[PDB]
Design a protein around this motif. Structure first.
Motif, short mmCIF file in Angstrom:
data_model
loop_
_atom_site.label_atom_id
_atom_site.label_comp_id
_atom_site.label_asym_id
_atom_site.label_seq_id
_atom_site.Cartn_x
_atom_site.Cartn_y
_atom_site.Cartn_z
N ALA A 28 0.60 -1.31 0.33
CA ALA A 28 -0.10 0.01 0.07
C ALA A 28 1.07 1.13 0.36
N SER A 29 1.90 1.44 0.64
CA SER A 29 3.03 2.55 1.10
C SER A 29 3.95 2.00 -0.55
N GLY A 30 4.09 1.38 -1.34
CA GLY A 30 4.67 1.59 -2.27
C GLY A 30 3.89 2.35 -3.89
N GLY A 31 3.13 2.59 -4.00
CA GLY A 31 2.64 3.97 -5.09
C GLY A 31 1.61 3.28 -5.95
N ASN A 32 1.06 4.25 -6.44
CA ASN A 32 -0.34 4.20 -7.29
C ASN A 32 -0.50 2.24 -7.80
N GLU A 33 0.32 1.59 -8.81
CA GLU A 33 0.35 0.93 -9.17
C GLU A 33 0.21 0.18 -8.43
N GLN A 34 0.95 0.38 -7.32
CA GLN A 34 0.98 -1.41 -5.98
C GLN A 34 -0.32 -1.19 -5.05
N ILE A 35 -1.11 -0.09 -5.11
CA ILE A 35 -2.35 0.63 -4.48
C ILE A 35 -3.45 -0.22 -5.22
N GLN A 36 -3.15 -0.29 -7.24
CA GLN A 36 -4.33 -1.07 -8.25
C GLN A 36 -3.95 -2.40 -7.80
N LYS A 37 -2.87 -3.00 -7.50
CA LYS A 37 -3.16 -5.07 -7.47
C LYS A 37 -3.09 -5.30 -6.36
N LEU A 38 -3.44 -4.26 -4.90
CA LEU A 38 -4.35 -4.34 -4.11
C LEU A 38 -5.59 -4.47 -4.34
N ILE A 39 -6.30 -3.36 -4.98
CA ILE A 39 -7.76 -3.28 -5.22
C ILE A 39 -7.67 -4.56 -5.90
N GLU A 40 -7.11 -5.23 -7.16
CA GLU A 40 -7.51 -5.69 -8.69
C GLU A 40 -7.54 -7.42 -7.52
N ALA A 43 -8.79 -6.82 -2.15
CA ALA A 43 -7.75 -6.67 -0.86
C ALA A 43 -8.84 -5.65 0.52
N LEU A 44 -9.35 -5.18 -0.18
CA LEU A 44 -9.79 -3.22 0.47
C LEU A 44 -10.80 -3.68 1.45
N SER A 45 -12.45 -4.85 0.91
CA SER A 45 -13.45 -4.76 1.30
C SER A 45 -12.64 -5.78 2.71
N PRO A 46 -11.46 -6.90 2.69
CA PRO A 46 -11.09 -7.78 4.01
C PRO A 46 -10.78 -6.38 5.29
N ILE A 66 -4.94 1.74 4.90
CA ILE A 66 -6.05 2.13 4.88
C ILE A 66 -5.41 3.42 4.13
N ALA A 67 -4.73 4.45 4.93
CA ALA A 67 -4.07 5.24 4.92
C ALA A 67 -3.30 5.57 3.59
N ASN A 68 -2.72 4.80 3.67
CA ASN A 68 -1.77 5.01 2.10
C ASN A 68 -2.52 4.40 0.76
N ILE A 69 -3.85 3.37 0.85
CA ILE A 69 -4.26 3.59 0.22
C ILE A 69 -4.81 4.59 -0.33
N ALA A 70 -5.72 5.40 0.15
CA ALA A 70 -6.19 6.85 0.52
C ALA A 70 -5.41 7.78 -0.15
N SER A 71 -3.96 7.84 -0.10
CA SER A 71 -2.88 8.69 -0.83
C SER A 71 -2.45 8.24 -2.24
N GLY A 72 -3.69 7.68 -3.47
CA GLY A 72 -3.77 7.06 -4.53
C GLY A 72 -4.72 8.46 -4.68
N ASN A 73 -4.73 7.44 -6.37
CA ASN A 73 -5.82 8.41 -7.44
C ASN A 73 -7.20 8.93 -7.09
N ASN A 74 -8.04 9.05 -7.14
CA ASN A 74 -9.47 9.33 -7.24
C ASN A 74 -10.44 7.95 -7.43
N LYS A 79 -12.75 2.96 -4.18
CA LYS A 79 -12.45 2.49 -4.35
C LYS A 79 -12.96 1.88 -2.86
N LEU A 80 -12.04 2.85 -2.28
CA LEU A 80 -11.88 2.89 -1.05
C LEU A 80 -13.12 3.11 -0.04
N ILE A 81 -13.93 4.57 -0.09
CA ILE A 81 -15.42 4.52 -0.12
C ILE A 81 -15.88 3.67 -0.58
#
Lengths: 239, 8, 240, 6
Positions: A28-40, A43-46, A66-74, A79-81
Motif C-alpha cells: 500500500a505504501s509502494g505507490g499507485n501501481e502497487q495500490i492498484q494490485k491490492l484493489i485487483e 484486498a480492500l473489503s477484508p 488504508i491511509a496509504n491506499i487513500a494516498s492513491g488516485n481519485n 474504491k476505498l469508499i
C-alpha cells in the motif's frame, strides 16, 4: 502471493494475520501501481472489515494500510469508499488511542483531497464534528493532520463550506492562526483562505469569528505561502 | 481558486 | 497441564528446583507467541517479575532472559508483562548489575519499545531514557548495539516521545554512532535519526545543532541500501 | 507519510 495474503486477512492465527497485514501495508505504501494490485486482488473489503472487531495491534496496521491506499488516485479513493471505509474511519476519531486517531485523521485528510463527491461522502459519514473537536483537545501532531483534512474539505463547494461552519470550525481555525507551531498556522491560514472564497453569508461568519485582525497579523509573516493566503482572505473580507 | 492538496 | 506446577516452583526454597522450573519457563518463553500465551494463562508473569528484586545472580539471569523472550510476543502479551510490573525492575537493572544481566534487560526493554505508543510511554514513565542514553558510550559494543535498537524503537513513537529522547540528551551520542566502527550500530543509529527527522520543526532544528547533516552526508555513499534510504530521508527532512 | 515503526 497476493491472493494468499488476502485470504490470510481472516485467519484465526494472529501471527499469520499480522504478517499478512504488514505485507499489505508495505505494498500500500509502494505507490499507485502497487495500490492498484491490492484493489485487483480484492484486498480492500477484508482490510476495512478488520477495523470493526479486531485487536488494537491489528487496527493500527489496518488503518496505516488504508491511509496509504487513500494516498492513491481519485478512482482508488473511490474504491476505498465503496469498500465501506468511511464509517469505521470516522468512528475511530471518538474512542481510539492517539496513535490510531493520528492514522485515521491522515486517511481522512487523504480522502478529502479527492473530488467534491468524495468530500461529500466524508461529510455524510459524519467526519466534520469529530475533526473540529480534534482542533482543541488533541496533540500538536493530530491537530496538524486535522487542520489539513479541514482545509481540504474547505476547498469543496459552498454547501460543503456551510457544513464546516455549522460543525463549528471557524472559532478553532481563527484561534490556530496564532498557534505556537508555524506548520499549524500555515494549514489554518490555508483553511481560512478556502472558506473566504465562499458566499457573502460565509464571509460574514468569518468576520464574526474574528478572522480580520488574526489575518492582518499574518501579512507580516516570513512565509510566502502564509502571506499570499492571508492577503487573499483579507481581500474577500473587505470586497 | 480553492486549494486542495494531497498529504505525503 | 505441567505449567501450574512450574509456576508454583518459582517460589520454592530449593534453588535447584527453582532453577529447573525457570529453565523450563525460559524454553517455553522462547518457543513463540502461542507458547508465551500458555505462560500468561498459567499466571507465570507476576512470579517471574518478582524474581528480579530479591533473588540471586543465577536466578536473575534466567528470569530476565525469559522476560526478554516474553517481550518478543504480540502487543497484548507485552501489555500483560507491563501489568505484571516488569518495567520498574528492568530499568533498575540497567545500572549496577552484571554486563550479562544489563544486556538481557536492554534486550527486554527494546522488545517492549517495539509495542504501541502507550507502551513506549510506560517505558518513559519508568525512567528508561536516562540509563539507555548512558549505555550509548559507557557500555560494551554489544550492549551499545542493544541500547541503540531500544532508542530507535522509542524514536518510532509520537513527537512528544521524540521530545523526551531529545531532553534525555540522545541526539549527540546518536550522531557520533553514525560513524561507529560497527555497520549494525550505524544501521540502528541512522534509523533512530530518520525517525527523529520525521518530527516537528523544533526537533529538526535540534538534529541540525547536534551536527546530523555532515554525518548523514557521509552516509549517502554507503553500500548498505537500508542505511542510504534512511540517510537520504533524514537529509531531505533537514532541508526544507 | 513515513513508517517510523519497524
Amino acid at each position: 502471493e497476493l491472493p494468499q495474503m488476502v485470504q490470510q486477512l481472516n485467519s484465526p492465527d494472529q501471527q499469520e494475520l499480522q504478517s499478512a497485514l504488514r505485507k499489505l501495508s508495505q505494498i500500500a505504501s509502494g505507490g499507485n501501481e502497487q495500490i492498484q494490485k491490492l484493489i485487483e486482488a480484492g484486498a480492500l473489503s477484508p482490510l476495512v472489515k478488520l477495523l470493526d472487531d479486531a485487536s488494537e495491534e491489528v487496527i493500527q496496521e489496518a488503518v496505516w494500510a488504508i491511509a496509504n491506499i487513500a494516498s492513491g488516485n481519485n478512482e482508488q479513493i473511490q474504491k476505498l469508499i465503496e469498500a465501506g471505509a468511511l464509517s469505521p474511519l470516522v468512528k475511530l476519531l471518538d474512542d481510539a488511542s492517539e496513535e490510531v486517531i493520528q492514522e485515521a485523521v491522515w486517511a481522512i485528510a487523504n480522502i478529502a483531497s479527492g473530488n467534491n463527491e468524495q468530500i461529500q461522502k466524508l461529510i455524510e459519514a459524519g467526519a466534520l464534528s469529530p475533526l473540529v473537536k480534534l482542533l482543541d483537545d488533541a496533540s500538536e501532531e493530530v491537530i496538524q493532520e486535522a487542520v489539513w483534512a479541514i482545509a481540504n474539505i474547505a476547498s469543496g463547494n459552498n454547501e460543503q463550506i456551510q457544513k464546516l461552519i455549522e460543525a463549528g470550525a471557524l472559532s478553532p481555525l481563527v484561534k490556530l492562526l496564532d498557534d505556537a507551531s508555524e506548520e499549524v498556522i500555515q494549514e489554518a491560514v490555508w483553511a481560512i483562505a478556502n472558506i473566504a472564497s465562499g458566499n457573502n453569508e460565509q464571509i460574514q461568519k468569518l468576520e464574526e469569528a474574528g478572522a480580520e485582525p488574526a489575518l492582518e497579523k499574518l501579512q507580516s509573516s516570513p512565509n510566502e505561502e502564509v502571506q499570499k493566503n492571508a492577503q487573499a482572505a483579507l481581500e474577500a473580507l473587505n470586497s | 481558486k480553492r486549494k486542495r492538496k494531497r498529504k505525503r
